[PDB]
Design a protein around this ligand. Structure first.
Ligand code: NA
Length: 121
């Protein structure tokens, strides 16, 4: 149908916008602490601590299969990255501090994206 194609043109454009948002968020992690999943070879107890791991590369695979239906879903995955890190690592670590910074710098980009998704559809 023609409705199905229009729905898909919108999913496609949401995906173009989220790819831009992803790049902006990742630029706020110059250290690359959140680029890849936590290694189970290197932290074999990790899944005892964190039930839903997340990282930028996993978000990117989902993004490119157009698996984000809306911005809420995307934001949930971004928050897992931050929130997982702040639980696993103690306050006085480079990892915890890197998450705090990504959250704060993330908040601006996400504030504007919610306006662009509301505005443009
Ligand atoms: Na903790």
């Amino acid at each position: 149908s023609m409705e199905q194609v229009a729905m898909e043109l919108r999913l496609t454009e949401l995906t173009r916008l989220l790819r831009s948002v992803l790049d902006q968020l990742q630029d706020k992690d110059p250290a690359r602490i959140f680029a890849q999943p936590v290694s189970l070879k290197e932290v074999p107890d990790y899944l005892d601590h964190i039930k839903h791991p997340m990282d930028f590369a996993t978000m990117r695979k989902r993004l490119e299969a157009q698996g984000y239906k809306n911005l809420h879903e995307f934001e949930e995955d971004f928050d897992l990255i931050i929130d997982n890190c702040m639980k696993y690592n103690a306050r006085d670590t480079v990892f915890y501090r890197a998450a705090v910074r990504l959250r704060d710098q993330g908040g601006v980009v996400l504030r504007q994206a919610r306006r662009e998704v509301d505005s443009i559809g």
